[PDB]
Every structure is written in C-alpha cells, then in structure tokens.
Amino acid sequence: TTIAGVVYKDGIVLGADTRATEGMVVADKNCSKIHFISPNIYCCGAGTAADTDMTTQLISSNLELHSLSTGRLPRVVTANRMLKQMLFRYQGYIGAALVLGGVDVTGPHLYSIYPHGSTDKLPYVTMGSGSLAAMAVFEDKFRPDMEEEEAKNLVSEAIAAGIFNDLGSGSNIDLCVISKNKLDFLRPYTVPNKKGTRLGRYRCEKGTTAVLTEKITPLE
Amino acid sequence: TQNPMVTGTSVLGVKFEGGVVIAADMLGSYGSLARFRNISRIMRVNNSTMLGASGDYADFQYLKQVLGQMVIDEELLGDGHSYSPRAIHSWLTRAMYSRRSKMNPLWNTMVIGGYADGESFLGYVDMLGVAYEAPSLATGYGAYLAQPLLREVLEKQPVLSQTEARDLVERCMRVLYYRDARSYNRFQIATVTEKGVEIEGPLSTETNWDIAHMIS
Amino acid sequence: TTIMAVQFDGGVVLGADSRTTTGSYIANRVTDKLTPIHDRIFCCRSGSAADTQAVADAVTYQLGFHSIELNEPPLVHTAASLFKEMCYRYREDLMAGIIIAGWDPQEGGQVYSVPMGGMMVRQSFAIGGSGSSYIYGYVDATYREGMTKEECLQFTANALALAMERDGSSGGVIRLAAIAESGVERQVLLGDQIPKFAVATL
Amino acid sequence: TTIMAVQFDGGVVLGADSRTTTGSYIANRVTDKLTPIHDRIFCCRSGSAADTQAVADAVTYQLGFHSIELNEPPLVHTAASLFKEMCYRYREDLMAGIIIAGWDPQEGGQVYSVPMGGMMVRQSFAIGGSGSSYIYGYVDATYREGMTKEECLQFTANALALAMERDGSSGGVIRLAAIAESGVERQVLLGDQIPKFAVATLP
Amino acid sequence: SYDRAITVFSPDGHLFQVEYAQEAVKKGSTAVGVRGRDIVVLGVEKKSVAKLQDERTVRKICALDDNVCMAFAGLTADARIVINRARVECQSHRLTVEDPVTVEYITRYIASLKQRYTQSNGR
Amino acid sequence: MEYLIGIQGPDYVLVASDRVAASNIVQMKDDHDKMFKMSEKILLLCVGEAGDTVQFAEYIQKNVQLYKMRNGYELSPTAAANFTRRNLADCLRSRTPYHVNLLLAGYDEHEGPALYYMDYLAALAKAPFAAHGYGAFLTLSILDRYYTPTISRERAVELLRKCLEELQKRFILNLPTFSVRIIDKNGIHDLDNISF
Amino acid sequence: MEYLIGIQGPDYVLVASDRVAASNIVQMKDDHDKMFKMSEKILLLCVGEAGDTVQFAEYIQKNVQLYKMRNGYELSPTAAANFTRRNLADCLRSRTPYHVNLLLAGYDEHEGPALYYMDYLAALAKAPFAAHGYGAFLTLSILDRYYTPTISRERAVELLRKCLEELQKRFILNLPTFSVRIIDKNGIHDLDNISF
Amino acid sequence: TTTLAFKFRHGVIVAADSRATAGAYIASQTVKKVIEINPYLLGTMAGGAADCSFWERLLARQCRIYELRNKERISVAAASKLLANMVYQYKGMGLSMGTMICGWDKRGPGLYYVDSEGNRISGATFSVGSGSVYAYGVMDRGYSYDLEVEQAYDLARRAIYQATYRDAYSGGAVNLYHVREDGWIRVSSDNVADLHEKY
Amino acid sequence: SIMSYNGGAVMAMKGKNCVAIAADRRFGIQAQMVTTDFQKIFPMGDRLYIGLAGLATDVQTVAQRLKFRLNLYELKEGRQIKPYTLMSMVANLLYEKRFGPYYTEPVIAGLDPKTFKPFICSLDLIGCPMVTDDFVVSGTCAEQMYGMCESLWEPNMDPDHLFETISQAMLNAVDRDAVSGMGVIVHIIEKDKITTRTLKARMD
Amino acid sequence: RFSPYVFNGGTILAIAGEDFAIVASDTRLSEGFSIHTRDSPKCYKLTDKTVIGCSGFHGDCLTLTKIIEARLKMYKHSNNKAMTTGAIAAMLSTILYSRRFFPYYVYNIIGGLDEEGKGAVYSFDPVGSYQRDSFKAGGSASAMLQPLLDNQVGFKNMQNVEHVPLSLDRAMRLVKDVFISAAERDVYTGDALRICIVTKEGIREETVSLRKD
C-alpha cells in the first residue's frame, strides 16, 4: 500500500495505489483505498484493510450525525478527534493507519493517524509499506503553497514511487483533489501498469470439460 | 559478528559516464547514540576500486585490513596485474558468504564502486553473500529513501554526467538526513574515475525547515 | 526526543526538539512536543506519542473545566497533579514522560516532572526524553541559581542542541516557549539558529 | 564506570573513576582503572573487569616483548592495534571497552578508543563506560582546541565528577594521569578535591 | 611415529623382507592340510614335544569361526596376532551380513592383512 | 511399549517377551523376536528406543561370541551382564547413547541360573524375576503374589501365563503372542508361544 | 483411544463402538457403552475427551427427549444432528469447549436411514459409512473397498466383522469387544457383541 | 506417499503411488517411488525423497562393490543391514527415511522394512507412507501366501488405489513391480483416475 | 493453519450477463478424506449464491447465520437482497467476530434482482469486501486458482465459455493441491436459469 | 538471532520439447518488500546443451552455480569430454545432498538436451531429489504456473483435444503468457523475462518486458 497526501495553496491532494495483497499474492488489482468521510473530507487507508474500512465508515457516520445536528459543514479536526480517540480506546488493536485530509472553514487540513492513536498535522504525509519511497519524493520536491496541478503531479509521483519501489504496492494511481470549491475524486488518475498482451490463445471450446451430472433449473 | 555494536547507516552509489560516485555519512552509531562522528566509512581499495560499508564498523576495519593487505601483496609482484573492481566484488562475495556459512557473519553491507577499462563498476555485497550490480545502489534506509530517487532518475535518464550524479547523490543524502534517524549531516563523496579515486570530505547538507511553521 | 523546562524569576522557559521516530525512521521531523494545556501552563511530551497526546488532551479537558468552575486561572501544580493522577492510574498502560511547566499568580513560574511511573516532583530545571541522558552533566554544570529569561532561553537552546547532536531519537528544530505573566512567547530555532558546536577533528 | 582521556599538545591526560559494582553492591570503591601498559602508554578500562584485566595483561606482555625486540619505545598506535586485535578477535567472548592513551616520540600524545566490538579510532578526547553517556553533552560543549595540561586535567576532572554524580555505577575517587615526554604524573582527587556542582534546590 | 620403508625393492627386482619372511616360515613346523569330500583335516608338527610343556597353549591349529579354522607355520607371535585379527573379522562379518564367512572371505582378509604389512611404512 | 519378563527358578530361567513390532498405530510385525542368544546358555532380552536395541545387542552379541572364539570358553552370565552394563554405562554419557531396557537371562554351571534386570541408565540388578514395559506394572505384583524360590518350571509357565492373561485382561495395548524360552543346563529351549 | 463406526444401508444403519474405558495404561472397564439412545430411532455415538463425552451427549439426550415431550413427536436424525452440531459449534469458542467426536445414526420415517459424521470442531457431514478413532485409518479403506449402497444387513455385519478383525490384526490397542446396534423402521435393535 | 510390498508364493509384489507434496502443494504426480537399486533388489521411497534416493543409491553403490569383491550378489538381509547401519549414524540429525528393501536371494523372497529411526524388520507384508494404514486395510483383508500372480497385481493396485482415495498426500499413478527369482520386472503404471473408472 | 485444516477451494468468475461459482467437494479432516459431497456454495436467493471455503464448521456456521439474517431481511424488507447489500451483510457478520474470527473467506456470485447485472466479490476472515469484475478465488489452493484464472479469464464470455473457463480453472487448480479436490461442482447463474454441473475430477 | 537465509524471489521455468529445451526466468531480485535490481537473470549456461535455473536465496544461487561451473571444468579435465545433462543432474543431486544439514535454499531446474538430441528437464528440491520432467515451474510463482502448464502442455482435464506435439513457437508463446500471468498476480515476479532456448544449434537468448511494479 502507498497512500500519500499534500496541502497546496487551495486545498488537499490525497493519493493512493490500488493493489491489495493477501500475503505476497496480488489479490485485488483495483482496490479503492481513498475513503469518503464527509463531502469535504476524505481519508486514505492503510494497515488492516477491514479495520480501515469499518473505522472510516463509523467515523463517516458519526460526522454525518454531527453535521446533521449542527447543520454546518463538518470540520477536519472533528474527524481527527473521533478517529484518534477510538483508536486510542482500542489500544492499537484496530490497525487503522489513516491519512485524513479535508477543507473546512479554517482551510485545508491534513492529518496522519497511527493505529495506536497518535496524530500528526503536517503539510505532507505518507503511509503504507511504500511510504518511505513516497516520503523521499515529498522531501525531494515539496514546496509550500503549490498550485493544484503541481500538487497533483507531486502526489502521483509519490504514489508512483511507492508502486515501483515497494512490492506491496501497484497497479494504478488514484487521486482525491479537495478544495473549498470542489472535490475531484480521480479514480484512476494514472495507469502506470498495463497488462502485457496475451501472445497465445487459451479459449477452451465447448465440450472440453467432462461433466458427470447436470441439473438445469429454470427461473422466472 | 553476532551482535553489531558501532554501525554505519546508508551508503549510496551511482554510476555515471566516466566513473562511479559513492557517498556515506561520517557517523558510527552505537545504538541510537551518535557516538563516533568523524569516521570514514569509505575505503580506497586500489587505483580503480573503492568501497563503502553500512553495518558493523569493526568488521569494515577488518575488511580494510584484509583487502588492503591483498592489494599490497598484489602490487609487490610488479607483474602488471591489478585486481579489477569486479574481482574485489567477487572476493567480497565469497568472503561474506563464507562467513555466513560458518554462521559467523561480517555484519556489513558494502558498495564496491570502480572504474576499469572504460567500464564503470558498482556492486552490492551484504552479510549473506547476496551480491549483484546495478546502476544505482543504496544500503540500509537508502534502499527506502534514496534508491527511489536514484532509480527514478536512472529510469528517465540512464546515463548521467558527473555533476548530475553528484547532484543526485547530494540530494539523496539530504533526504536520508531528513528521514533516517541514524544519519548525520557530515558525509564523504568518493568518486572513482579514469584519474583514480578521489574522496571529498567532510561535506554537509543544506536542509530546509520551512514546514516547521506550517502547522497552523 | 529531548524535552526541557527551566524555572526562572518571573516565569518558565520550556524547550523541546521536533523529532518523532518510528523505530529508526523519522516519521515526523517538525513535531510540536510543547502542548498548551491552559493559557499559561504548557507540558512537554515524551514517550509514546498516542499516550502523551491522550493524557494531554484529557488534562486539557479537566483543567479547562476546573478553571471555568473556579472562575480563575488554574494552578500549575493543579495541571501537574492531573497529569500525575492520570499517569499513575494507567502507569502499566501508558509510556509517557511529562514535564509540566507554567506560570500562575499564586506561586510564580513552576516546573514539574511527571516521568514514567507517575510520580510528581517540582524542579528548577527538568529534562526528559531519550536524549536528556546525554545532557545531565551539561545541565548540572551549566545551571546557575537565578538566570533571566534570555539566559534560560539560551541555556535551554544549548542543552537541546547538544542532546539533538548526540541522540538519534532527537533532532529536527528546537521549539522554545517562555511563559510569563504577560503571555507566552514561542520561537522555533532552525538551521544556524540551533547552537552549533565543533566536532573534535584531528 | 566512567573513563576518559583527553589529548593536549605534548601528551595526554587520562582519568577514571574508582567504582566496581556487583549489581548495585559496590565491590571495590577505590578501583584503579588506569593501567600502565608501557612506560608512557596507559589504558583506561571499562566493561567486564575480568575481561579488561586479562586483555590489558596480555597486551602488556605482547607490547613489552615487542619493545624489547625493536629496541624502541613502543608506539601508542601499536598498543591500540594490539588491544584492537585482541578485542576484535574475541568480540563475542568479551565485554571490554578500552581507551588507550599515551605518548610516543614519533607522533606525540594520542588517545584511541577501542570500544566493544573491537573497532579502533584516534580521537582528540575519548569517554567510555556506563557513565560517559551523562557527560557527552558537557564534553561536547566544553572541549576546546589547544588546551594545556592543566586545562585538560581540570576538564577531565570536571567531566568525571559530573558523570560520577549522575551514574550509580560511577563514583568513588577520580584517578588522573597525565603522560608526556617527561613521564607520568598520577593523582587521586577525593573529598573536596573532586569538583562539586550545586544541586538546584527549590528557592 | 616410526615411518621408515622397511620392505623395499632390490636391483634384481626383489622384496627382500618378503623373501626373508618366507625364510622365517621355512623354519617353522610343518603344517599339512588335506581337503577331502566331507571332512578337511589339518595336521601340524609338534617338534618341541618337551613333556613339561602343557600341550593346550602351544596348539598351532586355531579356530577362526564356527566353520573356519586354521593352522600356521612360522612365527607363533605373528600367528597369534593374525588369528585374533581374523576372529574379529569373522565376528564383524556375521554382524554386517547376518551370514558366516566363507573360507575365501577370511582367507582374502588374512592375505590382505599380510600384504598391507608388506607395503606400509615402519612394518 | 514392549514387554519383557524373566522368571528364575532353582535350575532354570524362564523368559518371555511380547512378539510385536509396532510403528505407533499399526502392528507392523506380529512374529517379532526380542530375544538374542549371546552364548549357548545366555539370552539377552532387549526393548527400548528403535534402532538402539538391535545395534547395541548385536554389538554385545558379537563381543561375547568373540570372547568364546578367542578363549575356547564362554563368558559366565554374570560376566556377560557386567560387560553389557559396562558398555551401556560408557555409552550413557557419550554422543551416542543407547536407550535400551535389558533382561539378561543365563545359566552358569557353577552359579546356577541367573537373571539380570537392566534399565536404560545401566543399573544392573540380579533378581529372581523381573519385567520391563508398562505391563510390568500389572504383572510384577502377580509375580510377588505367587512366586516361591522353589518353583517348578511347569508352575513357572502357569505363573507366566497368569501374567500374560493379566496383560490380556487389563493392559491397554494388544500383545497377543509371547515368545517363551527357557535356559537350563541343556541350553536354551524354545517353549510354546503363549498365544491369545 | 476410542473407536466408532457406522454403516448405513438402504433401510437400516449399522453402528458399532468399542467397549473399553481406559486410564493411561489400564482398561478400567470392558463393558462400556458409547451409544446413547436419543429417541426411539436415533443413536448418538460419542467419543473424545474424558468427561466431555457424557456431559455433551447427555445434554443432547435430555434436549431431544424434551423436544419429544413438548411436541408429541420426535426429532428427525437430520434435525437432531443439526441441533447437536449447533450446540457443539456454539460451545466451540466459548469458555467451556467440548472435545467430542460424534456419530449420529438414525432412521427417519420420511427420509429413511441417516448416518452423520461430526468432529470436535462440529463440522457436520452425512455419510454412507463413517468412523472415528485411530482405527478409522485402518477400517475406512475396507469400507471403501467393500461397501455397496444396496448392502444387506447380514452383509453389513459381515463387513463390520471384517473391519473389527482388521482392528484385531493390525491395530495396537486392545479392543476385544464391540457393542453393535441396528436402527430400523422398528427402532434400535441390539445385535450381539462382536467379541474376539 | 503410499508404498506397500508383500511376499507371496511367486515372489514379491511391490507397489507405490507417485505423488510428492511440498506441504499442501502437490509438487509432482510422476514420482518414481520404487527405487531400482540393482537388477535383483528393489527399494521404496517414503519420508524424504532426497534421503531415500541418496541413501539407496549409496546402497546400490555398496551392493555393487560387494558383488565385485565377493563374486556373488548380495542378499536382502545384508543389503538391508547395510542400509540400516548407514542411516543409524544420523539419529537425531533429521533423516526422514522409511523404506522397504525387496528382493530374491538364496533364502527365497525377501522383504525387510528399514527406516531412519533404526527399525530393520523382515516380514510377509508391509506398507510405508502417510497412507500406509489405508493400504494395510485392503492388503491385510486380501492377502494370502497363495495369491495367484494376477490376483496379487490386483490386490496391490487396489490397495494403493484405496490409499490414494483416502489420503490427500497420496495420488498420481500406481507403479507396480514384481520381484521374481530372475530379477524384478515392471508390471504396470496405472493412473488412479483410470483405476477409478475401473473400480 | 486453521484455514487449511479441512482444505476447501471456492472461486467465482464473472461473465457477460452471467456469473459462475464453483467449489471443490472434499470434506476432509486434515489429510483424511471424509466425504466427497460437502456443500460449500449455499443459495442466498434465486440468482445469488455464496461460496465458503476454509474451516468446514465455520462454513456451516457462517452460511446458517447468514441464511438466518438473510431470511429475516427478505421478510422484513419485502424484496430480494441486492448482491452488494448481501456483501455488506456478510462483512458485518464476519467483522462482529473481529477478534474471535470465523475461519472462512466467502465468495459471493450473483445477479442483481432488478437489473441482472453480474456481481462477484470476496471477503477475508474479518470481513473486508473486495469486488472485482473478472474473478475472485478463495481457499487452500488460492495461487493455483490465481494462475488458472489470470490466464484463462477473458471478458464478455457467454455461459458456455464461462462454464469451460471456470471448470478448467477449478480442475487444474485443485489438481495441484492435496487437501482440495475430490470433485468440483459448478453453478452457472444466468438471467433465466441456474445451471448446476458436477465434474469428472480426479479422486485422489 | 542471525539468519543465514533470505528469500530473494524469482520464478523459473523449464519446458522440454522434441528437439529443444526452454529455460526461462524473470530478472527481479528482491528482499522483503524492496527490489534490489530489475536485471538479475536466473538462467545460467552450463554447457552448449544445458541451462540451469536457480531461484531462492541468491547467495546460495551464486555459490551453487560457481560450484557447478567448477565441477563441469573438473569433469572436462579428468574425463576429456563435456558433461551430459543427466550427468549434471545427478552431480547436482550429490552436491545438494552434500549440504543436507545446512541446505542451499535454491530451487533448481536443469533444462537442456540429452545425448539423443531430445529435450530434457530435471527439476530439483533444495536437498537434491531430482526427477526428469517434461515441464516444471519453480520459484515464487511455481504454484501459479504449474497448473496452467499441466493444462496447456500436459493436456490434462481436456476432453476431445488431440495431443499435438509441442512446437518451439507455441511453447515460446506459452512461456511469455505464463510470465505475463505470473507478473500480474505475484509480487516477486516481474521487471523482465529472460528466455534461454537450448537447441542443437546452440543456446539462444531472448528478453521481453514484464511489469515493473
């Protein structure tokens, strides 16, 4: 997994890959690792995938309760406190390692949330097994208050470095560009990896498989 | 060595057109303690071969001892045969594998850069005998933080100049200083070319801490 | 991690580095380890980051509610006692070393240590973290009775520079905070502002 | 243990504490941790007492025989190479951090660290032991280029007194030794001779 | 250890130590063996009868296994050494093949023992 | 577990052993002999770790047969017992120990009959009866109950059959047949295999 | 170790169990029934960890009897098997797990005969023949070799006698007698004990 | 793995499967688990395939040296005793070997089971492997010394088939050899799917 | 490993307007085969199946509690469940046992009851859903199934080529796993019919 | 504690033909979750008729193949002829058993020509059990590639298909297809595919691309 996020002049660019591994086998080639939290806040997820899924769904639900009650657009620090207090309550056993980005009334805010419950409010964060490659790209080329497309190229470059340099990362680059005026959930943003064209042909025609019994059941 | 004591962090290395450049910081870390801060983790092997080592530093001093005695004993003969960089790399591969096979490893990871007969050499050897060659090498946390930058440039532009390789090396050492907890802002850059091995040091990084104000 | 706070006449000077390590990877190199607990009471967080952020937020909650009920500024010994009760009650679940330092109208500038285990002691200067071990001799040799604000800022800056120089867990920038009656002045020392020292070359 | 050796112009100053602990029982409280290897070469011993005594005895043997063969006073680099060879060859067998410091006619006053594992490095000043961790910051902010014999004696005594104050495995008396061309001057600091540092009590 | 070449060649092509060992055999008592149909008979010469001699300990006919015995001629001390070596080898062969020796097997063993002491150092 | 038993009368030694070789669930051989003829009047009955039994006992057997070849007379059963005990005790602290439980049965012309217990540590014990295996726990009390030192060999076979009937009744492993031999002045005699 | 076998024919289920209770080397009981009559046409056959067998199986027994008394009709073997599997799986990850291996035989009025295999994890399988124990390893191949779905009950008792004779021949544990029962349209019938 | 062998009136029938598994992954379906030691002895392969293959090849080497030195072929007893003495020097060192040395000699047919734990037992019938118990079932139910030769082939093929049917670690082909007095022969290699259609 | 205790090998493959789900038929306790007709694909609707590999007791437990929850859902709601909603139901059921987890990994193959769009997905043991458009595999022969399906799956297959593809994938995949196999049953799910076939598989 | 082993990944493959053997492998050397180099072929020429594929612990791969090259030279010196492929197979069996108690963690598949000119594949375990095959995958994606070559080369579980002889071109397309299929799903398989084709004309060598992630 390589997930990454920056803060540019007008907002948040989040990024992720799409490879899910079960062991050292690519199980899903097109996993969606950028998760809805609120209409202004998304969250990238790494760690135990079921933990990040159910964790982000519960906190997305609680921000929906919260913003229905307040009638306001929810803050990124509210999602931050909910995430870090539940992950500290569960003693680090829910392995939800999360990149929390969003734009609210106080501006663009970016968070990285560790499974034990510690948070970092940073202009650029990366997580996953391919996090150090992407942080090498960020420490190489980050400028404060970039343009939108400079930040998109930077985050796609960080995710691409994690893809090509880490075995647990690959197959596509997703982005989520967040600002005050929009929400560009770019899935996919880049396809770096194409499957090689099949040179042969393996269409096993009708009658190739021997059948012992057959039960046809018609439907309505 | 079963338990390494004073160790070194990442040693970089990248080939360019006309030679090889490697780099390593000047720190021996005894645990988390930055204990020995003016050591040289780069050996000049002979006129066309140089070495740099991560891992345990006493074992690197043993390998400096043995390999320097090999190059002395070779040059005593005066018969016009020098060890190639590939020969030093093969000797180290066999040495580290033989120490592995006795279950008494030399706790190192070594980058053998060289330039012989118009041909750059850059070879990796670790404590197990896993040895190979690459246009860019990086040990320790350099494989995580600098080998991405090195291989991204070497995939766009496969043949570097000497200043392009030096700039890439210094910028990778900057990244290693930001994100490796055992690095140090004091490093040597050694460049073997057709003119020989040239160790420049100490050099330091120009860091950037503008994000220390970017909280609120 | 190296945290430090020095009492002077009129207030306190706090200091911390900015390096958070995940093993030997610098996960965060601009970490704000100086947490404002109340308006003139800060803490210095060392140890497990989740533990220190949890206990700092909980003492911030309890202390702000205490101050609104009592309609007064809180005592620094009150915030230190709340850290003591939390860090002693969960001392087998927490790995958190805290230095509480602040000012209050009743008892001046104060520095309290709450290390791991959950005890509490008032000190003139406190150091903590994995890098404070490398500057115990420096702060024993250098601390003078009755330094001023600028002298304590310089003393804290020098000792944190030394600890950042020797510890691998320490590094980054120096975050200083000086708390007095007029308010809190904070400053970040980065690059050449961090006090350099010569390595004994040749 | 806190051991220390500082190089000046014309020789070195060595310094150690005197405490040998068996856990938290002080087995010897006046331990002489400075060992004369040769006439103008000492070693500072830290680590396992049996290991450091045996290695210092064996290097004393080898270096004395070497100096009688060569009809020369030995080098300080030679003594440190012997400690390095014995502490590297038996690095899984020993717990021995040695500072070798002395004088030689060819290169002057030299201090070499041979820490655990068995590497070897020449340093301007060197500290070691369990207590040296407490005075890394003091010796870095305090060491000056070009100090005299008396300034190096006072710097060694101060840093040893600081380390002996914070370490429990360090304490006792301060055994100093300055080695130059003229010879070896050893002295013991005790009582008020050890530099005091005032505890910051609450005003 | 003693490692001189005792048994060597001669300019006429002869191993003189082997020929002199044959001379040592030709001063020993006359051992005669005849192979019959269902019996094999050994008979040796006493030649030092000497009625004070207890006749059991100077028997020159020794049994090697349940089905192999032997008679010798020559040095009885060398003989007793070779007899004990052959008895050990008969037991080792019953151990390793679960069958007794053939007479060819233990004869080949005794002959290879004698030949190895014609070519080894210091023997 | 494998079962041995010896019974020492006035002028005979009666030994029996289970006739089973097993591999942990299956009885791979149900006609397996655990008795080893050392000499014409000495049996060594061996159970223990697999491999060690046959290797150790064939070592002991070739050295006792080699003693007879070297010397024209046999070892006494006392000397065979002490030889076996000595080799087992020497190999106890070596690199290759033998984990074998031993009953050495024997008839001497002067000493009479003799039975020797020997555990795997090589403690040697002369006994009027002895047994190994977990079936010894069930059968030695029957032997304590019914043995007298003047027992006839017919009553000894009936007492042996009482022990084996107890193994059929009460013991948990199937041990259907038992190789029964007897040693006296006329040598070693195969008695009838007690079967169930 | 404890042996179960069921052989399910066209209008019957033949079941057998070994009849031995053991304590570590001894058999404490040799007329020990491992078949627990659930209803008039259902047998549960229960082996496994000591204590857990009688507790779990008598729990299932009293609850099937409670079903019959509450309802005025019995559970089917499918419904009893699924109830038994539900209780054994609901106790699996709890504080009190039962380590019991089960055979559920039974004749249903509508569905005919049924034989249910169930292990200690409570995975329930329906089988024409099934067996527990280490003797299952020796006898399921005989069953596979000689079972036909149209086997008569005399031929099924013959096939059972082949499997138990294999236990007497090859298996290491003394399993002399076997309780044998058939469930029919007429209920549960005790056959003779197949003894050896 | 499933091997078996039984002595009957007309020699020794040896049978084996052909499946080698690397844990749960079936590495091969064509493993020759009846090692052809010389033209007069057969050995089998259960335990480690490399251990069995190496030590019975070294057995073949030593038996051929025996035949050259003594001008006669070795017996089954001496060959199995050599194999047992070879593998006895590695107790606790981790050899996984379980095998059956099968042949004819001057005592008639020979069948000695030899393993790395140190057993060396002769016997009328054996079965070695993970599915050895399912082979002992069918084999012990169908065995007599007076099996006719085709009936002995049918017994061994059916027992290896039933063991492959129950054991997961057994499968592939049923390789069947027959040791006669003039040396062994290869009888059949029948795929277990084909025997499934047969049976 | 708790998963490999019984074996188990289930896959689900997507076609054009059709899905295929296929499972092996061995129930075995470790090495010993017990039955050859174990059900590992249960019906969860007319055009909606779930396949469960793993520990056979948790196959039965998860399938029965899912059928419980599903019948209550389809009566309380008055509709057949959408296959995405079934996936969320299974994911909830597995994640309730997050630290006490059901050792089974489901695959769901079905058509939408209103749109007849093909749905396949699969889950881990604690309920991480994973929807694909080509194939999902689950069981002790996972890598064999990934090799066979990644080679043989081609888009837009009719149910005949879908049957042949999932059949060759399952057969040659479970013929390289020991504790799997002993038969393969294959369910082709079309709009207008359910085709259920069992295959001539190897029985060793 | 010190571990003398690391898993370096890499899938190797051999296919025998009627007049050829093909030995193929990827070029990715790995360790843990990082890629050492993308150009590290695992096929090694031994004679003019033999290529060995080595995957597993790469230190043992380097050492083992240098030992095999040394022993080929020792045979050619003392026997005045090159080794046959079956001789290399049996020699490597004794070599891999010579380290039985501290094994080479190497997956070996010798592919080449025999003395009849036909294809020969010998696939080994890490401790030297070899048998002769028609095709074998070994290495990281061996469980991914061995069923498809049971299907498409072995013709298993196919009814009503004539078992045609395996040409060079169809087997080359099979090798390229199995490695694209393995580089999709295996994380250790990728970056390139080195194919060595052993015919009677020689050993020709062909590299194609794979995924770089």
JSON list of N, CA and C in Angstrom, two decimals, chain A residues 8-26:
[
{"chain": "A", "resi": 8, "resn": "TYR", "atom": "N", "xyz": [-1.81, 21.95, -0.76]},
{"chain": "A", "resi": 8, "resn": "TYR", "atom": "CA", "xyz": [-1.42, 23.01, -1.67]},
{"chain": "A", "resi": 8, "resn": "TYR", "atom": "C", "xyz": [-2.10, 24.32, -1.24]},
{"chain": "A", "resi": 9, "resn": "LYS", "atom": "N", "xyz": [-2.00, 25.33, -2.11]},
{"chain": "A", "resi": 9, "resn": "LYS", "atom": "CA", "xyz": [-2.49, 26.67, -1.79]},
{"chain": "A", "resi": 9, "resn": "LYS", "atom": "C", "xyz": [-3.99, 26.71, -1.54]},
{"chain": "A", "resi": 10, "resn": "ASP", "atom": "N", "xyz": [-4.76, 25.92, -2.28]},
{"chain": "A", "resi": 10, "resn": "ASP", "atom": "CA", "xyz": [-6.21, 25.98, -2.16]},
{"chain": "A", "resi": 10, "resn": "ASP", "atom": "C", "xyz": [-6.82, 24.75, -1.52]},
{"chain": "A", "resi": 11, "resn": "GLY", "atom": "N", "xyz": [-6.03, 23.73, -1.21]},
{"chain": "A", "resi": 11, "resn": "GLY", "atom": "CA", "xyz": [-6.67, 22.53, -0.70]},
{"chain": "A", "resi": 11, "resn": "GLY", "atom": "C", "xyz": [-5.80, 21.32, -0.44]},
{"chain": "A", "resi": 12, "resn": "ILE", "atom": "N", "xyz": [-6.36, 20.14, -0.69]},
{"chain": "A", "resi": 12, "resn": "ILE", "atom": "CA", "xyz": [-5.76, 18.86, -0.31]},
{"chain": "A", "resi": 12, "resn": "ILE", "atom": "C", "xyz": [-5.71, 17.97, -1.53]},
{"chain": "A", "resi": 13, "resn": "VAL", "atom": "N", "xyz": [-4.55, 17.37, -1.79]},
{"chain": "A", "resi": 13, "resn": "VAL", "atom": "CA", "xyz": [-4.43, 16.32, -2.80]},
{"chain": "A", "resi": 13, "resn": "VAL", "atom": "C", "xyz": [-4.05, 15.05, -2.08]},
{"chain": "A", "resi": 14, "resn": "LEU", "atom": "N", "xyz": [-4.96, 14.08, -2.04]},
{"chain": "A", "resi": 14, "resn": "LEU", "atom": "CA", "xyz": [-4.69, 12.77, -1.50]},
{"chain": "A", "resi": 14, "resn": "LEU", "atom": "C", "xyz": [-4.37, 11.82, -2.64]},
{"chain": "A", "resi": 15, "resn": "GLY", "atom": "N", "xyz": [-3.65, 10.75, -2.34]},
{"chain": "A", "resi": 15, "resn": "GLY", "atom": "CA", "xyz": [-3.30, 9.78, -3.37]},
{"chain": "A", "resi": 15, "resn": "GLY", "atom": "C", "xyz": [-3.18, 8.40, -2.77]},
{"chain": "A", "resi": 16, "resn": "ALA", "atom": "N", "xyz": [-3.42, 7.39, -3.61]},
{"chain": "A", "resi": 16, "resn": "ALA", "atom": "CA", "xyz": [-3.31, 6.01, -3.18]},
{"chain": "A", "resi": 16, "resn": "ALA", "atom": "C", "xyz": [-2.99, 5.14, -4.38]},
{"chain": "A", "resi": 17, "resn": "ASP", "atom": "N", "xyz": [-2.53, 3.93, -4.11]},
{"chain": "A", "resi": 17, "resn": "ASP", "atom": "CA", "xyz": [-2.46, 2.93, -5.15]},
{"chain": "A", "resi": 17, "resn": "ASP", "atom": "C", "xyz": [-3.74, 2.11, -5.17]},
{"chain": "A", "resi": 18, "resn": "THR", "atom": "N", "xyz": [-3.73, 0.99, -5.90]},
{"chain": "A", "resi": 18, "resn": "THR", "atom": "CA", "xyz": [-4.91, 0.16, -5.98]},
{"chain": "A", "resi": 18, "resn": "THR", "atom": "C", "xyz": [-4.65, -1.32, -5.74]},
{"chain": "A", "resi": 19, "resn": "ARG", "atom": "N", "xyz": [-3.42, -1.71, -5.44]},
{"chain": "A", "resi": 19, "resn": "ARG", "atom": "CA", "xyz": [-3.10, -3.11, -5.19]},
{"chain": "A", "resi": 19, "resn": "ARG", "atom": "C", "xyz": [-3.42, -3.50, -3.76]},
{"chain": "A", "resi": 20, "resn": "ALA", "atom": "N", "xyz": [-4.19, -4.58, -3.60]},
{"chain": "A", "resi": 20, "resn": "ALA", "atom": "CA", "xyz": [-4.34, -5.25, -2.33]},
{"chain": "A", "resi": 20, "resn": "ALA", "atom": "C", "xyz": [-3.65, -6.61, -2.40]},
{"chain": "A", "resi": 21, "resn": "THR", "atom": "N", "xyz": [-2.82, -6.90, -1.41]},
{"chain": "A", "resi": 21, "resn": "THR", "atom": "CA", "xyz": [-2.11, -8.17, -1.33]},
{"chain": "A", "resi": 21, "resn": "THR", "atom": "C", "xyz": [-2.67, -9.03, -0.20]},
{"chain": "A", "resi": 22, "resn": "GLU", "atom": "N", "xyz": [-2.82, -10.32, -0.48]},
{"chain": "A", "resi": 22, "resn": "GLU", "atom": "CA", "xyz": [-3.08, -11.33, 0.54]},
{"chain": "A", "resi": 22, "resn": "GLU", "atom": "C", "xyz": [-1.82, -12.18, 0.64]},
{"chain": "A", "resi": 23, "resn": "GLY", "atom": "N", "xyz": [-0.94, -11.81, 1.56]},
{"chain": "A", "resi": 23, "resn": "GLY", "atom": "CA", "xyz": [0.36, -12.42, 1.61]},
{"chain": "A", "resi": 23, "resn": "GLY", "atom": "C", "xyz": [1.29, -11.74, 0.64]},
{"chain": "A", "resi": 24, "resn": "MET", "atom": "N", "xyz": [1.90, -12.50, -0.25]},
{"chain": "A", "resi": 24, "resn": "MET", "atom": "CA", "xyz": [2.72, -11.93, -1.30]},
{"chain": "A", "resi": 24, "resn": "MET", "atom": "C", "xyz": [2.10, -12.21, -2.66]},
{"chain": "A", "resi": 25, "resn": "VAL", "atom": "N", "xyz": [0.77, -12.28, -2.69]},
{"chain": "A", "resi": 25, "resn": "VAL", "atom": "CA", "xyz": [-0.02, -12.52, -3.88]},
{"chain": "A", "resi": 25, "resn": "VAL", "atom": "C", "xyz": [-0.94, -11.32, -4.07]},
{"chain": "A", "resi": 26, "resn": "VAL", "atom": "N", "xyz": [-0.97, -10.76, -5.27]},
{"chain": "A", "resi": 26, "resn": "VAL", "atom": "CA", "xyz": [-1.86, -9.65, -5.56]},
{"chain": "A", "resi": 26, "resn": "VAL", "atom": "C", "xyz": [-3.29, -10.20, -5.61]}
]
